[PDB]
Amino acid sequence: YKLICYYTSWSQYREGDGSCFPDAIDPFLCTHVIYSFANISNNEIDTWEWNDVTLYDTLNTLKNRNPNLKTLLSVGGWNFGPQRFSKIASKTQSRRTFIKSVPPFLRTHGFDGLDLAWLYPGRRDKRHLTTLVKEMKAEFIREAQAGTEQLLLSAAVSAGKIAIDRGYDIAQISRHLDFISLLTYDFHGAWRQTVGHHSPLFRGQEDASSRFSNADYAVSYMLRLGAPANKLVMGIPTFGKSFTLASSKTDVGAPVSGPGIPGQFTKEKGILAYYEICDFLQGATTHRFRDQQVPYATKGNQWVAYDDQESVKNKARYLKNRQLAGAMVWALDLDDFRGTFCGQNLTFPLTSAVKDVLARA
Numbered sequence: 001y002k003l004i005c006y007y008t009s010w011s012q013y014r015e016g017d018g019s020c021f022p023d024a025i026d027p028f029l030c031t032h033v034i035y036s037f038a039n040i041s042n043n044e045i046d047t048w049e050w051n052d053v054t055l056y057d058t059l060n061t062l063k064n065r066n067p068n069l070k071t072l073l074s075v076g077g078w079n080f081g082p083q084r085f086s087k088i089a090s091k092t093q094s095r096r097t098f099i100k101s102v103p104p105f106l107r108t109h110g111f112d113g114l115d116l117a118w119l120y121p122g123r124r125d126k127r128h129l130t131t132l133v134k135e136m137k138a139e140f141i142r143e144a145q146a147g148t149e150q151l152l153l154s155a156a157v158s159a160g161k162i163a164i165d166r167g168y169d170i171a172q173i174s175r176h177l178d179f180i181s182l183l184t185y186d187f188h189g190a191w192r193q194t195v196g197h198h199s200p201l202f203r204g205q206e207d208a209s210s211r212f213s214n215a216d217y218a219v220s221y222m223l224r225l226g227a228p229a230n231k232l233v234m235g236i237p238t239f240g241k242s243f244t245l246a247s248s249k250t251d252v253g254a255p256v257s258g259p260g261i262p263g264q265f266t267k268e269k270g271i272l273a274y275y276e277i278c279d280f281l282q283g284a285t286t287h288r289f290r291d292q293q294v295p296y297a298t299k300g301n302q303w304v305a306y307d308d309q310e311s312v313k314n315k316a317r318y319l320k321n322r323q324l325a326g327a328m329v330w331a332l333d334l335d336d337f338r339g340t341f342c343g344q345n346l347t348f349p350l351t352s353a354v355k356d357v358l359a360r361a
C-alpha cells in the first residue's frame with residue numbers, strides 16, 4: 001500500500017513549535033513525500049520560496065536513511081492561478097517548453113517525480129490537461145533511456161462530481177499517471193451559511209441533496225469513470241475546518257456567520273491544524289456523525305469539523321476493502337509532528353494511525 005504525504009513550504013514560517021522543516025519528517029513514516037508548491041516562470045518549473053533549494057536538499061537527505069523513500073515535487077497549488085495553468089497548457093509552444101524543463105530540474109534537486117496540482121481545470125481545459133499529462137509522461141519515458149530510473153508522474157484531482165465531469169478525462173489520464181490522489185476533504189466549507197463536515201466517509205441517510213459529497217461516492221464514481229483501483233489514492237486530512245456559530249444551535253443545519261477564528265499557529269481563518277484541535281478540545285463538547293463516521297467539536301461560538309485517530313483508521317480500512325492503491329495525507333505539518341500537543345508523546349498520530357491500518361491487510 002502507498003502512503004503519500006504532502007509537506008508544505010510555507011509551514012517553516014509558523015511561530016514557535018508550529019514551525020516545521022522537512023528535518024522533522026520521519027523517513028519511515030510515508031512511502032512517498034511530496035514537496036508542495038513549485039512555481040512556473042518563463043514557462044519553466046521553478047522554485048517558490050527563497051530557501052527552497054535548501055529545503056529540497058534537507059528533504060531529499062531523508063533518502064539517506066530510507067533508500068526506499070520516494071519524493072515528488074508538486075506544481076501548482078491554490079495560490080497558483082489556474083488561469084496560469086490554463087494558458088501554459090493551451091499552447092503547444094508554452095506547454096512543450098514547460099515539459100522539457102521538468103526532468104533536468106527534478107534531477108538537479110533530487111526528486112523522483114512530478115505531482116500536478118492544477119486546482120481545477122474548467123470545461124475548456126479538459127482537453128489540454130489530457131495533452132499535458134500525455135506529453136509529460138512521454139517525455140519522462142524518453143528521459144529514462146539515459147539509464148536513470150523513470151520519473152514518476154502524479155496528479156491531485158478534485159473529489160467533487162461536478163468538478164470531475166467538468167475538467168477531467170479520467171479514463172485517458174489514468175493510463176499515463178502513476179497514481180491519482182483524490183481530494184476527498186473539501187465537501188463543505190464556509191461558502192454555505194450552514195455547519196457541515198468537509199470529509200465525511202458516507203452519505204448520511206439524513207440529508208440527500210449532495211448525496212455526491214462524501215468520500216464513498218467520489219471513489220465509486222472514479223472507479224466507474226475508468227480509473228483503475230490500483231492507481232487511486234484516497235485523501236485523508238490532518239486539519240479541520242472551523243466555523244463561527246450564528247446562534248446557540250450546534251447540531252446538523254446550525255446557522256453560520258463565517259469561518260472560525262484563526263489558530264494561534266496556523267493563523268488562517270477557517271482552518272485548524274490537528275495539533276491546534278488537540279488543544280481546542282480541552283473544554284469542548286465532542287460529537288460524532290454516526291452515519292458519516294466523522295467527529296466535530298464545539299466550545300463557545302466555535303464549531304470544528306475534524307478527523308481523529310478513529311475516523312482516520314476507518315477511512316484507511318475503507319480504502320483497504322475497496323482495494324485502492326493507498327492513502328494520501330494532506331500536510332504532515334498539520335499533524336502533531338512534534339507529538340507534544342495531543343496527550344500521548346506520539347509523533348504524527350494521525351498519519352501513524354493510517355500507516356498502522358495499512359500495515360495490515
Ligand SMILES: *[C@@H]1O[C@H](CO)[C@@H](O[C@@H]2O[C@H](CO)[C@@H](O)[C@H](O)[C@H]2NC(C)=O)[C@H](O)[C@H]1NC(C)=O
Pocket residue numbers: 039040041042047048049084
Ligand atoms: C512565480 O512566477 C511568476 C512568473 O514569473 C511570478 O509573477 C510575476 O511578477 C513579476 C515580477 O515580480 C511581474 O512582473 C509579473 O506580473 C508576475 N506574473 C505573475 C504570473 O504573477 C511570481 O512572482 C512567482 N511567484 C513566486 C512566489 O516566486
